[PDB]
């Protein structure tokens, strides 16, 4: 089998992106936000306190003639920009551009953090990390494409952000109408649950590629690429008036900047993130002061190629009993 679906900005500044996903029996369709840095699929749903509830479209698993309450489980998942959401789980049917999968737990929220309520335009998460990470006690749940592995035609998915405007998550199957060039697979450690890998480098515009070894995660579901404060300190030393604010938490820079490109290292080939994908808009509506899409990691523990990077290539999740990932152009 294979499946197939659109992913949408939510909004101007490709902050996150939402998949929509087939729910239960008649399905219920809610736009999740696929994230390889979590194994959790959880939803807004009927039973999410009400005062936390802000236009999501919600989950309701009564209406489901499929849907069964997994006796005992509950959730609770803390995410690295401090949101946090905690619930029960019910096993039913769920379905992402036409692939099946039964029997998939679905972690019902009972309770989100603000900023979850504040965006109506995400209606929950599909973790696509390791399913050692899955949060649900006292039995541990697989994640949707853990549990579709075995079906899929191969053990893979494959992720194609848009800048800008609309992408692709294809499970099972490579789209080589999707990419240039070749792909270049580099490994993978699974020892923390993500998708850890190690970049061979970066160039700052058109300078020199400076080779060294940068372990991070490939990581959908956060937005800006956060690499080590040597590297972005290098990155933004190149734009005029460019600084890094306590008071704004980051670096930022003048708006009326032309931003350089960034490129990293997949083993020897070259992924060039353009200088305007890194630009993140006014830090506050009407400023002149714009935040930067490339952060330092210093105070994260990891580094970070979320969306800036991963959108500037089409990116394979090699989910075969030695994972790997794959990077190419396009």
């Given at each position: 089998s294979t499946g197939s679906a659109t992913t949408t900005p939510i909004d101007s500044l490709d902050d996150a992106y939402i998949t929509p996903v087939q729910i239960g029996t008649p399905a219920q369709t809610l736009n999740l936000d696929?994230?390889?840095?979590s194994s959790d699929l959880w939803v807004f749903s009927s039973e999410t306190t009400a005062s936390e509830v802000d236009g999501q479209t919600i989950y309701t698993p009564?209406?489901?003639?499929t849907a069964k309450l997994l006796s005992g489980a509950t959730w609770s998942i803390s995410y690295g920009d401090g949101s946090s959401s905690s619930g029960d789980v019910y096993t039913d049917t769920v379905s992402v551009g036409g692939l099946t999968v039964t029997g998939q737990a679905v972690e019902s929220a009972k309770k989100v953090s603000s900023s979850f309520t504040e965006?109506?335009?995400?209606?929950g998460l599909l973790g696509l990390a390791?399913?050692?990470?899955?949060?649900?006690?006292?039995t541990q749940q697989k994640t949707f494409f853990d549990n579709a592995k075995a079906s899929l035609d191969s053990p893979v998915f494959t992720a194609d952000l848009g800048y800008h405007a609309p992408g692709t998550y294809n499970f099972?199957?490579?789209?080589?109408?999707?990419?240039?060039?070749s792909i270049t697979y580099t490994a993978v450690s699974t020892k923390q649950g993500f998708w850890e890998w190690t970049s061979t480098g970066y160039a700052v515009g058109s300078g020199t590629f400076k080779s060294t070894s940068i372990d991070g995660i490939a990581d959908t579901g956060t937005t800006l690429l956060y690499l080590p404060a040597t590297v972005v300190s290098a990155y933004w030393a190149?734009?005029?008036?460019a600084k890094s604010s306590s008071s704004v938490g980051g670096y930022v820079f003048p708006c009326s900047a032309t931003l350089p490109s960034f490129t990293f290292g997949v083993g020897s080939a070259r992924i060039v993130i353009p200088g305007d994908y890194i630009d993140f808009g006014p830090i506050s509506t009407g400023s002149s002061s714009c935040f930067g899409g490339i952060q330092s990691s210093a105070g994260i523990g990891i580094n970070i190629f979320g969306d800036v990077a991963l959108k500037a290539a089409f990116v394979v999740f090699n989910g075969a009993t030695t994972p790997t990932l794959g990077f190419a152009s396009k």
């Open positions: 696929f994230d390889t840095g009564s209406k489901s003639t965006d109506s335009t995400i209606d390791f399913s050692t990470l899955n949060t649900v006690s006292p099972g199957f490579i789209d080589t109408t999707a990419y240039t060039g190149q734009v005029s008036g």
